[PDB]
Amino acid sequence: AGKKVLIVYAHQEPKSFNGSLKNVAVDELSRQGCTVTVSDLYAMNFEPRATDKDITGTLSNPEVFNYGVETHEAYKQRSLASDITDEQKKVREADLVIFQFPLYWFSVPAILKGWMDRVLCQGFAFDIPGFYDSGLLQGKLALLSVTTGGTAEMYTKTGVNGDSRYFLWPLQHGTLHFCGFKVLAPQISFAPEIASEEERKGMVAAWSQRLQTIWKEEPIPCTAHWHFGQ
């Protein structure tokens, strides 16, 4: 049984350092005989706003719109915007989903928040009950590959930004873990623009080297204790 990789990619510039780590994951994965699919949100002009256009049928309650309620209802009736349902097809068949993005404001760029807000609806990705260890996308792995402007040092418990695990919490636990993904260790490439030309190639190389053995890696424990300590 061959492996399936979905990369959700969020950068404007294919020549960018994020474009490079994306190309090198497609390369290393393609080589190993993985089936690969890239969601290039910018190039697709992916829609980020969560609005009533996301739904094709009669609304449940047409006079007071409620996104959570209508999308969950639309999922069940098979009436989501096809752009959503296309993403959900990619996620359903992926064994692994890689997120490739530059950190914006300690988080994901809005276009990518949009993908998460819109793709991971109730009924598809989780249910109540049916979240955390019981989320609907259980059996799947996720990994964030994040580029930052801050250095390794800025990102320590003692530096100006606090530890890097601090900002991972909403993404890794609050989103991915909530939906049933197991989460591999993140790939964080610090300050590529401040790095020298060779340290840059090294960071890219270290990501290729890492992917050669990714089917062997085990999931982080995705808990408060991993992220925060005490």
User: CB of 100 within 8 A of CB of 18?
Assistant: yes
Tokens for 70, please give them: 């209508």
| Cβ at position 96, least distance to ligand O73 in Å | 21
DSSP secondary structure letter of residue 107: B
Contacting range for ligand O73; rule: CB under 6 A; set: 20-28, 35-43, 114-122, 139-147? 114-122
DSSP secondary structure letter of residue 193: T
Tokens for 197, please give them: 């030309």
Interactions with ligand FAD, residue window 120-179 (CB under 6 A): 147-150, 174
Report the residue from 24, 44, 69, 110 that binds ligand O73 according to the rule CB under 6 A: 69
Here's the x/- map for its own copies, 80-109, by CB under 8 A: it reads as ------------------------xxxxxx
| Cβ at position 202, least distance to ligand FAD in Å | 9
* Of residues 195, 205, 186, the one with CA closest to residue 20: 205
Q: Determine the Cα–Cα distance for residues 93 and 167; give it in Å rounded to an integer.
A: 28
Query: How far is C-alpha 14 from the geometric centre of its chain's CA atoms?
Result: 18
Contacting range for ligand O73; rule: CB under 6 A; set: 39-47, 57-65, 119-127, 163-171? 119-127
Q: Apex CA 191: angle with CA 188 and CA 194, to 5°?
A: 155
Q: Judged by CB, which is closer to ligand O73: 28, or 70?
A: 70
Residues near 67 by Cβ (< 8 Å), separated by ≥ 6? 50, 51, 52, 54
Lookup result for tokens 């996301």 = 54
Report the residue from 122, 164, 172, 189 that binds ligand O73 according to the rule CB under 6 A: 122
49 binds, among ligand O73, Zn ion, its own copies, none (CB under 5 to 8 A by kind): its own copies
User: CB of 159 within 8 A of CB of 170?
Assistant: no
Contact residues for its own copies (CB under 8 A)? 12-13, 15-16, 42, 45-46, 48-52, 63-68, 104-111, 113-114, 116-117, 120, 132, 149, 157, 160-162, 166-167, 169-171, 173-175, 178, 224, 227-228
